[PDB]
Amino acid sequence: ENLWVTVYYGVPVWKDAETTLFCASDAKAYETEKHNVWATHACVPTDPNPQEIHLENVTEEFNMWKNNMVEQMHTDIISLWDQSLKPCVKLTPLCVTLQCTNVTNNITDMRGELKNCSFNMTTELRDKKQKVYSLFYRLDVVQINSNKEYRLINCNTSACTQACPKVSFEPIPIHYCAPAGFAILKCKDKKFNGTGPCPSVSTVQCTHGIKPVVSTQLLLNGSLAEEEVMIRSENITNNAKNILVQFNTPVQINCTRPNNNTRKSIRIGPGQAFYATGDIIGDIRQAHCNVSKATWNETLGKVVKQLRKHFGNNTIIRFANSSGGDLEVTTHSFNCGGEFFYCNTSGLFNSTWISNNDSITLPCRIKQIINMWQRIGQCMYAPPIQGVIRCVSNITGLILTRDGGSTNSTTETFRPGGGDMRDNWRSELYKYKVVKIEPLGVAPTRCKRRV
């Protein structure tokens, strides 16, 4: 009935696509003269106020387990960490034999944790040598066949780099923004499991502040829920998929290192220095972390109540400790002010639940030669820190796992897991999606072009 093709430009149509995002950093702490391992000089300042646009009658489909933003964030974090350790001292001449002996002195019983080692080291002049001593943890030295012979644990895999002493490891919020022609969709559904149609879709200019916190078996300083404890998994039937838990209310954890350290500088070359622990003044005590018993019990009860819905109605829920493996996957590993902790989370996951001012002290261990990002051939030798360190944090999540069930029911045991850093950022980049705007369309009107 006299209908002809009409071209419209600028129609609101979008399709799924993958692109590269950039920074947006707050200007409050952007101007300070403090260097961080996550660079800020290459990130543009953020907008003074975000622009939130609500979409009516729009129903999009999200999927938290197939998002490219997590992979891009992982690549950027790894690249930043690799770039932050370049311009300064490399500890190649430290692969020498050592004459180590027990520290003793004040031992509360840390019997063999610390060792007093002496060695020969080069000086600024090429033809002279100096004899110095340093204190090393038991997790860094390996005996080679009373003053016995020891050696560093990395002296047969790779000569590594010393951590730059001018940088800091404190996380800072990072915003990711899409380029022109691309939009970010935000799911505002409070009860969303990360996978499926979202009723409340809202166009957001960028993202919020996401702190790159590195931890295992627990989530520290994350995003809390709004209504109830949320359990999200890719396949709840499969036992080979990790389970992500989000806490409604955060519990408090305090960590400290009671020893008062003392850092001394040793010159190993022209313009190069090595930082060692000379003496410990005071008393020697173990590092520990504490969790309030009642708040943890209430949080675990809420987790059990919200976990009962998926599995059954009369099955018992049991919590056990880790199974085995490396030290980084069986302990709660984190960073407190520049010192790396490895805490024993065995008194936390120890309960059995039936359908019918105390604190929990967690012993921890400290290591100086670490190897993160699950790589082989690179270290990050953290220098000693003078004084006493303390940290107060929030526990706003869990990474649980399930064992192979027997008799198909009547028991379900959950133990903590971890190891992969993508699960840390999947818990925060779950409400976001990237789309590509297509502005060209055709529709039938009754125009005929003048001839």
Partner 1 sequence: FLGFLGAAGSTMGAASMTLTVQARNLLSGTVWGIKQLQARVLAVERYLRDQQLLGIWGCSGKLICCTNVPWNSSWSNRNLSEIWDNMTWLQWDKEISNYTQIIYGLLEESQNQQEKNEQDLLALD
Partner 2 sequence: NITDDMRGELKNCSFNMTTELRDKKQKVYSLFYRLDVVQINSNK
Ligand X SMILES: *[C@@H]1O[C@H](CO)[C@@H](O)[C@H](O)[C@H]1NC(C)=O
CB contact at 8 A, 365 and 341: yes
User: What does the DSSP 8-state code read for residue 387?
Assistant: B
Nearer to ligand X, 67 or 233 (CB): 233
Q: Quick one: residue 46, left, alpha or beta (phi over 0 = left, psi -120 to 50 = alpha)?
A: beta
151 or 175: CB nearest partner 2: 151
| Binding of partner 2 by 151 (CB under 8 A) | yes
Question: Which of 437, 400, 426 lies closest to 415 in space, CA to CA?
Answer: 400
Residues 390-449 interacting with partner 1 (rule: CB under 8 A): 437-449
Candidates 39-47, 339-347, 380-388, 409-417; binding stretch for partner 1 (CB under 8 A): 39-47
In angstroms, rounded to a whole number, what is the distance separating the alpha carbons of residues 88 and 163? 8
Q: What is the DSSP letter of 70?
A: H
- Separation between Cα atoms, residue 65 and residue 194, nearest integer Å: 8
Shortest reach from residue 170's CB to partner 1, in Å: 20
**Residues in 174-213 at the binding interface with partner 1, rule: CB under 8 A:** 179-181, 183, 203
Decide if residue 125 touches partner 2 (CB under 8 A): no
Q: Give, as one character, the DSSP assignment of residue 44.
A: P
How far is residue 273's CA from residue 215's CA, in Å, rounded to a whole number?
A: 30
The residue among 44 and 96 lying less far from ligand X, judged by its C-beta, is: 96
Indicate which single residue of 33, 56, 109, 358 sits in contact with partner 1 (rule: CB under 8 A): 56
- Residue 432's SS3 state is strand
Q: Which of residues 17, 155, 320, 391 is near partner 2 by CB under 8 A? A: 155
Is residue 87 helix, strand or coil?
coil
Sequence-distant (6+) residues with CB within 8 A of 402 are 239, 243, 412, 413, 414
Structure tokens belonging to residue 328: 């980084």
Q: Is 445 in the site for partner 2 (CB under 8 A)?
A: no
Residue 314 interacts with, from partner 1, ligand X, partner 2, none (CB under 5-8 Å by kind): none
- Minimum Å gap between C-beta 153 and partner 1 is 31
What's the DSSP call for residue 93? T
Count of chain residues binding partner 2 (CB under 8 A):
8
Which of 286, 351, 411, 413 touches ligand X by CB under 6 A? 351
**Using CB distances below 5 to 8 A depending on partner kind, what does residue 420 bind out of ligand X, partner 2, partner 1, none?**
none
Closer to ligand X at the Cβ: 12 or 181?
Answer: 12
> In angstroms, rounded to a whole number, what is the distance separating the alpha carbons of residues 18 and 284?
53
Binds ligand X (CB under 6 A): choice among 11, 42, 44, 388: 388
Number of residues counted as binding partner 1 (CB under 8 A): 49
Name the nearest CA neighbour of 278 among 114, 112, 110.
114
Q: Residue 20 touches which of partner 1, ligand X, partner 2, none (CB < 5 to 8 A by kind)?
A: partner 1
Q: Which does 95 bind (CB under 5 to 8 A by kind): partner 1, ligand X, partner 2, none?
A: partner 2
Tokens 């379900």 -> residue? 412
| Min CB(155)–partner 2 separation in Å | 5
> Which of 237, 356, 406, 407 is in the footprint of ligand X by CB under 6 A?
237
Residue 269 binds what, of partner 2, partner 1, ligand X, none (CB under 5 to 8 Å, by partner type)? none
CB of 106 to partner 1, least distance (A): 47
Instruction: Check if the beta carbon of residue 168 is closer than 8 Å to that of residue 116.
Output: no
Q: Considering only residues 43, 65, 93, 366, which one is a binding residue for partner 2 as defined by CB under 8 A?
A: 93
Across the strands, what pairs with 130? 121
Is residue 10 within the footprint of partner 1 (CB under 8 A)? yes
Sole window of 17-25, 80-88, 151-159, 233-241 interacting with ligand X (rule: CB under 6 A): 233-241
The structure tokens 């604190």 sit at 359
Q: Which of 348, 339, 354, 294 has the alpha carbon at shortest distance from 319? A: 348
Contact by Cβ (8 Å): 31, 25: no
Residue 293 main-chain phi, psi, to 5 deg: -75, -45
Contact in structure between 277 and 261 (CB atoms under 8 Å): yes
Residue for token pair 């407190």: 336
Residues 6+ apart with CB under 8 A from 406: none
Nearer to partner 2, 156 or 235 (CB): 156
Q: Does 57 bind ligand X (CB under 6 A)?
A: yes
Instruction: For residue 391, give the 3-state DSSP assignment.
Output: strand
Task: Note the residues at the interface with ligand X (CB under 6 A).
Answer: 56-57, 97, 99, 103, 105, 116, 118-120, 131, 133, 193, 195-196, 221, 233, 235-238, 250, 252, 254, 260, 262, 279-281, 290-292, 297, 301, 309, 313, 321-322, 330-331, 344, 346, 350-351, 359, 387-388, 392, 394
Task: Note the residues at the interface with partner 1 (CB under 8 A).
Answer: 1, 3-14, 19-20, 22-23, 39, 42-43, 51, 53, 55-58, 76, 79-80, 83, 179-181, 183, 203, 437-449, 451
